[PDB]
């Protein structure tokens, strides 16, 4: 269906112990494909997926220069923001940036993004219309006036509608064997007695791709969403994901509960119960 | 506001002497750099700073040193002047490494000389309008001639009735060498100021050519019998000339 | 690498002038810049164009004709003024060194020629306002096509033509100054090296 491409960037100042640490990562949907770390032995933009490895040396050199340029812009911006916020040069501060595009099943732009945060809070964001900005405070307003003066939004919208969309298409085509293959969850139900009066029923979903999934518990076919403990989806470490959903049930009533699994890799939704 | 303030605009140095070229920027610019401009060599980067406490070498760093104590200042030090350092130096600042607000300082015209005895202030003379010009065109041109100065570090201005004038003035774009093939040659500079004949025909009208010359400082050593050629103003002047009737024309 | 093929360009005052620039980069990301350097030597920022900007940069009388396919970034100066006579430098920064260094062209010397309404070529002798027998020769009021040649005599100093503008009456005039310490030097011979109008006024 829909797919996405995102670039993430984090810069962290470290006063009295060198210059800022810069880390950037690139994703196609839930697949990491490129990375750059300012603390690497000799910093280079590196591949992290097999379908990106066939890009030429010109590609690797350009991506490396862009990350180095972003790290440098962030170092300067960290100093500017100390002035905007009347902050001390002694403290550690964070600048984060995310940008990217979403494409429909046809390969046409659905949504574009460009957002910045300072110390974990929204700083400035490109609006959903890709032509105007939203500044979070009076300091971000200084940035907005600069970016409006340079006509940044027009050039960024041109990237989001153009190269972002086209390269995402090329990556999707080159990595179709993996990016466009949905791996269904391996599913099971565990039973954990608490006391002679109650037990936990835990519904597991393992080794799935992409991360998006719906796990619900039902009682006599009626939704138990309010009563369900859902853990945060977690990476297995091999590009696939794991998740569980649990309910606390009266002992001897376990048979009234069904777990329901919805995932792209499943041709039809799954219904499971505790064995037996 | 003022942007980049680079000092001094002009400098003459004896070989082996030191000097600090000053550069301040009031724009909160993170990036500052020094370039030198030379015939054929174009503009070459000497040293640059991406921020306070950080400095790096450019294409031509030898014989130069820099420091970035604060964001505002980026001084260039010449520990021991060499004649090869005769150039025009430019301080250039911008918002950051990839910045587009690419502004330059006024420039520093540096002349490194082996001996300060080659340094001379200008002699200045005002040449009065021709009666033939007045009669032929109803206009009167005055000429200012600044001669025998070294180095070519002068600012010529015209003053009419105590006020600086710009309209009707043309000053040669560059001082001309009196002996061109010589790097020790003294210079000459001419300028014209043209007024109406009626304006020139008033004896109360006062025309002064001012030449600001940039030379030796108080600290510079001076071993000649002639007056030390210190930075100074040298002027020449003329008054208007009324007719035989002694009546200023209306 | 910046190529300004023209060491010099001339234009008639009020007319527009194009100063050529071509640039050489293998980068997709770069910026083109123009600077003006008047005779006083200051380096004045005029205009900038980014390689990803779709619209041609304009800043007052300055327009940058950016032709990405042709690798050209010619500067167009509309309605040329006398104050536009100066050196113009085309310059670029690119992604290769993180946009650090400016690469400057050799520059183009723009000479804006005034439109001489009523030429009245003449060579006048001007005498020092002070107690000396010193003189100067002033060649003035010639049209912008007349050229002043440098002297082929070592002891004769001739300036290049200078345009003055008497703003109040919008009157512009060309002039050149000649002087010498030689005994035979007279305003009659001062401009022999130059091809001056045959009817140039030589007062008695």
């Amino acid at each position: 269906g829909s797919h996405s491409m995102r670039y993430f960037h984090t810069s962290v100042s470290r006063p009295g112990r060198g210059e800022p640490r810069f880390i950037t990562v690139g994703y196609v949907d839930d697949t990491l494909f490129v990375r750059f770390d300012s603390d690497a032995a000799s910093p280079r933009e590196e591949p992290r997926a097999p379908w990106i490895e066939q890009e030429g040396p010109e590609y690797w050199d350009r991506e490396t220069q862009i990350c180095k340029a972003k790290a440098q812009t962030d170092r300067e911006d960290l100093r500017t923001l100390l002035r905007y916020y009347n902050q001390s040069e002694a403290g550690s501060h964070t600048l984060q940036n995310m940008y990217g595009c979403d494409v429909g099943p046809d390969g046409r732009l659905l949504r574009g993004y460009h957002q910045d945060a300072y110390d974990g809070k929204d700083y400035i964001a490109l609006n959903e219309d890709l032509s105007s900005w939203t500044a979070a405070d009076t300091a971000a307003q200084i940035t907005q006036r600069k970016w409006e003066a340079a006509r940044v939004a027009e050039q960024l919208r041109a990237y989001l509608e153009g190269e972002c969309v086209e390269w995402l298409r090329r990556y999707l085509e080159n990595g179709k064997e993996t990016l466009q293959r949905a791996d269904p969850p391996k599913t099971h139900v565990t039973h954990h007695p608490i006391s002679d009066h109650e037990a936990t029923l835990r519904c597991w979903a393992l080794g799935f791709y992409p991360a998006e999934i719906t796990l619900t518990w039902q009682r006599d076919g009626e939704d138990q969403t309010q009563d369900t403990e859902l853990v945060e989806t977690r990476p297995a470490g091999d590009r696939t994901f794991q998740k569980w959903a649990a309910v606390v049930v009266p002992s001897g009533e376990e048979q009234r509960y069904t777990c329901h699994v919805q995932h792209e890799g499943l041709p039809k939704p799954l219904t499971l119960r505790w064995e037996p | 506001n003022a942007g980049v303030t680079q000092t001094p605009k002009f400098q003459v140095l004896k070989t082996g002497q030191s000097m600090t070229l000053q550069c301040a920027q009031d724009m909160n610019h993170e990036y500052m750099s020094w370039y030198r401009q030379d015939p054929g060599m174009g503009l070459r980067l000497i040293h640059y700073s991406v921020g306070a406490g950080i400095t790096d070498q450019g294409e031509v760093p030898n014989g130069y040193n820099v420091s970035r104590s604060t964001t505002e200042d980026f001084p260039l030090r010449l520990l021991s002047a060499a004649p090869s350092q005769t150039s025009v130096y430019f301080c250039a600042s911008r918002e950051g490494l990839g910045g587009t607000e690419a502004f330059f300082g006024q420039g520093t015209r540096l002349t490194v000389v082996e001996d300060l005895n080659k340094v001379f202030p200008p002699e200045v003379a005002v040449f009065e309008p021709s009666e033939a010009e007045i009669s032929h065109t109803q206009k009167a041109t005055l000429v200012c001639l600044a001669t025998g100065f070294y180095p070519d570090h002068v600012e010529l201005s015209w003053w009419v009735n105590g006020k600086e004038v710009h309209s009707g003035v043309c000053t040669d774009p560059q001082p001309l060498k009196e002996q061109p093939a010589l790097n020790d040659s003294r210079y000459a500079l001419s300028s014209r100021l043209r007024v109406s004949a009626t304006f020139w025909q008033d004896p109360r009208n006062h025309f002064r050519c001012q030449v600001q010359f940039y030379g030796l400082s108080e600290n510079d050593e001076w071993t000649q019998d002639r007056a030390k050629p210190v930075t100074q103003i040298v002027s020449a002047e003329a008054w208007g000339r009324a007719d035989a009737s002694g009546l200023v024309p209306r | 690498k910046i190529t300004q093929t023209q060491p010099g360009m001339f234009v008639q005052e009020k007319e527009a002038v194009t100063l050529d620039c071509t640039y050489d980069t293998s980068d997709q990301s770069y910026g083109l810049f123009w600077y003006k350097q008047p005779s006083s030597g200051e380096m004045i920022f005029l205009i900038y164009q980014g390689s990803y900007d779709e619209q041609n940069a304009t800043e007052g009388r300055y327009s940058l004709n950016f032709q990405k396919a042709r690798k050209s970034a010619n500067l167009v100066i509309s309605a040329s003024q006398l104050g536009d006579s100066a050196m113009y430098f085309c310059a670029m920064r690119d992604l290769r060194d993180n946009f650090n260094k400016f690469y400057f062209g050799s520059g183009t010397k723009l000479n804006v020629k005034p439109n001489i309404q009523n030429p009245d070529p003449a060579v006048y002798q001007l005498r020092d306002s002070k107690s000396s027998d010193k003189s100067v020769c002033l060649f003035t009021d010639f049209d912008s096509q007349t050229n002043v040649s440098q002297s082929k005599d070592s002891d004769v100093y001739i300036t290049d033509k200078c345009v003055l503008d008497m703003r109040s009456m919008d009157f512009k005039s060309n002039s050149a100054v000649a002087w010498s310490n030689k005994s035979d030097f007279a305003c009659a011979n001062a401009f022999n090296n130059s091809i001056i109008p045959e009817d140039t006024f030589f007062p008695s």
Partner: peptide
Amino acid sequence: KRWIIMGLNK
């Protein structure tokens, strides 16, 4: 494929 332009300082 990343985006880049000059003059993006905050």
